[PDB]
Structure 1
């Protein structure tokens, strides 16, 4: 799929992901949710080759849910991100690699800190205040470099995110049909229904 954005503010992580799905020359769906809840305080968005994205995300989801039941304990966002990276680093040297890029947004309940991890299909992990995959960063990083502060509120984070989407909508040739926005904080995961 096309565009996935992420931003870590003071007390939460915000993920924005496009709604479009295209086969051939036709847009089959304009309300697709490119994300899976890995645990109550960990969300993963994804983008890459057709089919591989969902299969990979659901496979990761199943493994983390299995861990949660076995230990009766939620893994830290850092631990989950490391598990995901290893699976992708394992995948890249397989017969047929999984062509999937992800952002992992989580709230660490132990440290009381939001955390955003960017991982590409090769297994390249980086912790960031804000991140993106593909061409999305080419348009948005200049705005984020300018406006971003670490003490921003969730509402200020959403306003800066709106500005990023507006820039994408102006200068990108592709129509990605807007974005679904989700917030990850101490209370869990919720969706912003109006954006």
Structure 2
């Protein structure tokens, strides 16, 4: 599958997502951004079934942007993650389920704390210091279990991810063509354009 990683440090949540899009025997694109901004302080990454992936992401984005306009307010990350969980939970029992796994990284401006939510296609939600979907976790959870600390700086977090990506580029069979990294904090969402060699 695609690589979806997330880590919550002291004052931010970092999301890392692979850039490859492979169909059968060919790598069709190597600069794919597997993410959608749901609100100024909430980001969602996703991986899974070919078409369902983006269709689900964009559908969720539309609903949150609608809520934002109607209320002139921004839903808390926990609220958004719960909305996303219900949608996936409805889907698993429908005619044709969305086979999509997601990570939701947001900065709650009211609590002033970053939050990371991992939700699989069944509607299974859990809040974690770090998370991953697919095969990635099998190599990264033991790394993070070892090198993670709650008081890490955004910079220490980025060095931790670099370590994770190197392990993935060493042991995983597929060439996922690197990752795109985005930071979510009290000031919003920004993309680290320099990770191809940080």
Q: TM-score per shorter chain, which class?
A: over 0.9
Tell me how far 1:24 sits from its aligned partner.
1.8
CA distance in 1, matches of 2:23, 2:135: 20
Structure-1-length-normalised TM-score:
0.99
Q: Deviations over 1:5-63 (max 9, x none)?
A: 00000000000000000112000000000000000000000000001000000000000
Q: Deviations over 1:49-84 (max 9, x none)?
A: 001000000000000000000000000000000000
Unaligned runs of 5+ in 1: none
Q: Deviations over 1:123-146 (max 9, x none)?
A: 000000000001100001111000
Q: Does 1:108 align with 2:108?
A: yes
Unaligned runs of 5+ in 2: none
CA distance in 1, matches of 2:121, 2:43: 18
CA distance in 2, matches of 1:128, 1:52: 25
Q: Does 1:30 align with 2:27?
A: no
Q: Secondary structure at the match of 2:93?
A: coil
CA distance in 2, matches of 1:24, 1:114: 38
Structure-2-length-normalised TM-score:
0.98
CA distance in 2, matches of 1:2, 1:74: 30
